[PDB]
Amino acid sequence: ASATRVIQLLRNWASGRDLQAKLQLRYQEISKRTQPPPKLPVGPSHKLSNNYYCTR
Amino acid sequence: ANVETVAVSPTICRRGGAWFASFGRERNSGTKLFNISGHVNHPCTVEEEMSVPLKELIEKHAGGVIGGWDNLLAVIPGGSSTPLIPKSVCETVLMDFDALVQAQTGLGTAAVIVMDRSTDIVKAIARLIEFYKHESCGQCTPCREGVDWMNKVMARFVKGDARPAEIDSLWEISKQIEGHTICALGDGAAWPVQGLIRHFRPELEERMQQFALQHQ
């Protein structure tokens, strides 16, 4: 956030809480809009042997 | 009828069935032609009593294994269609139908192929599978497709390209082929692979490990 400290004090007094601690606008703590690629694990039926479909 | 089966027919008649029987164990009567080839000092063919032990047959008529009997690695007792057996079994097994059935291989055509500790055991089985791939008539699905599939898998096994989880996979492929084909060529293609996997799995696994090591 970014505002005058006297306005922050007035806000805290009127609301009764420290507003700055839990700001409702996301300034910079959220995840990046670009991420590394994933890998994604395969399922339990991805076996090469002992996997006849009639048993599952 | 097989040529050998017919040729003996008149001698059995003249001498009698009782005489012919007087040779070999029960249900294993008569004499037999054996072709001893591979890693033996004197490869040949010889007539012998049915239930002769394998070791006596190899060391007497064929001159033994090159490098001594302790140089022996494996023996295919009845031609390529029968599963191979290791030296642990070869030293005490009899050369008849029931005895070799109890050794999980089978007498086959009584064509002993000997391989010593100096051969690539996977390469020999791969060559046999290539023979079966080239000899399939192609009529039925399990043979026509699965024998070619097994040939490709085995050629990759020879190099070590595969992973251990494929070995069991290969086993199941053979099981699907065996007993599901019109002809018994599918059985003869699936049995050598089963023998190699049953008796020489660690060699396959270490070949895969080596290939991974120098390839990463």
Ligand SMILES: Cc1cc2nc3c(=O)[nH]c(=O)nc-3n(C[C@H](O)[C@H](O)[C@H](O)COP(=O)(O)O)c2cc1C
């Ligand atoms: C793929 C294949 C090839 C065979 N080739 C021969 C062969 O070359 N000679 C032979 O006597 N039997 C061969 N057989 C087995 C025959 O079925 C067998 O000769 C026939 O049943 C009669 O043989 P027998 O006199 O021993 O009873 C072959 C079987 C298969 C499945």
Ligand code: SF4
């Ligand atoms: S199993 Fe026999 S009939 Fe079937 S494709 Fe092979 S050779 Fe032909």
